[PDB]
Design a binder for this molecule. Structure first.
Ligand SMILES: Nc1nc(N)c2ncn(Cc3csc(Cl)n3)c2n1
Length: 167
C-alpha cells in the first residue's frame, strides 16, 4: 500500500491520472519523481521548468554542479539527484526530443531507466514540447516499464484522448 490516489489502472503495473506533476508530487512526496530532462539538465520548460520552479531553483543549482563534474547525459539516459521539496529523489530521464531531430527509437531506452526504481511518479516522456506522439509514448511505457509507475498527464483533453484510445 502506497499514497497515490485517484488513478485509473491501465495494466498490472501502470496507472494514470489527469494531474499537474508539481501538485501531484507536493501532495504525495513520492520516493521518486521523474523529470523530463534534457542532456544539459537545463530546466527551462515543460515538466523540468515547472519542477525546478517549485524547488525555488535548487534543482537547477544542483544540476549545474552535476554537469560541471560529469558532463551531459545521453539521450535515452538518466541520473538520480535530489527530489528537494517534491520527492526523496528526482530521476532525470532524457527522452528523444522530436523537435530537435533526436531518434524516437530511444524512447524505449529512456523508459528502461524506470525499471531501476520500484515505484515512480512520472510524466509521459517525449510528449508535449518534446514533439512525440503521446499515444505512442504511453504504449512504449506500458510495454517497457515493469516497475510500478504512476503517470500524470496535465492536459485534460490529452488525458481524455489517451484513455479512450488505450488498447
Ligand atoms: N503531468 C504533467 N505536469 C506538468 N506540469 C506538465 N507540463 C508539461 N507536461 C507534459 C510533458 C511530458 S514530457 C514533457 Cl517535455 N512535457 C506536464 N505533465
Amino acid at each position: 500500500v502506497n499514497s497515490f490516489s485517484g488513478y485509473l489502472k491501465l495494466t498490472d503495473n501502470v496507472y494514470i491520472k489527469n494531474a499537474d506533476i508539481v501538485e501531484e508530487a507536493k501532495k504525495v512526496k513520492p520516493t521518486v519523481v521523474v523529470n523530463a530532462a534534457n542532456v544539459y539538465l537545463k530546466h527551462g520548460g515543460g515538466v523540468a521548468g515547472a519542477l525546478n520552479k517549485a524547488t525555488n531553483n535548487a534543482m537547477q543549482v544542483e544540476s549545474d554542479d552535476y554537469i560541471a563534474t560529469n558532463g551531459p547525459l545521453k539521450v535515452g539516459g538518466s541520473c538520480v539527484l535530489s527530489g528537494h521539496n517534491l520527492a526523496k529523489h528526482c530521476l532525470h530521464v532524457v527522452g528523444p526530443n522530436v523537435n530537435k531531430g533526436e531518434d524516437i527509437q530511444l524512447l524505449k531506452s529512456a523508459y528502461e531507466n524506470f525499471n531501476q526504481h520500484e515505484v515512480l511518479l512520472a510524466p509521459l516522456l517525449s510528449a508535449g514540447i518534446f514533439g512525440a506522439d503521446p499515444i505512442h509514448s504511453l504504449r512504449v511505457c506500458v510495454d517497457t516499464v515493469r516497475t510500478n509507475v504512476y503517470l500524470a498527464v496535465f492536459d485534460k483533453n490529452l488525458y481524455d484522448k489517451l484513455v479512450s484510445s488505450f488498447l
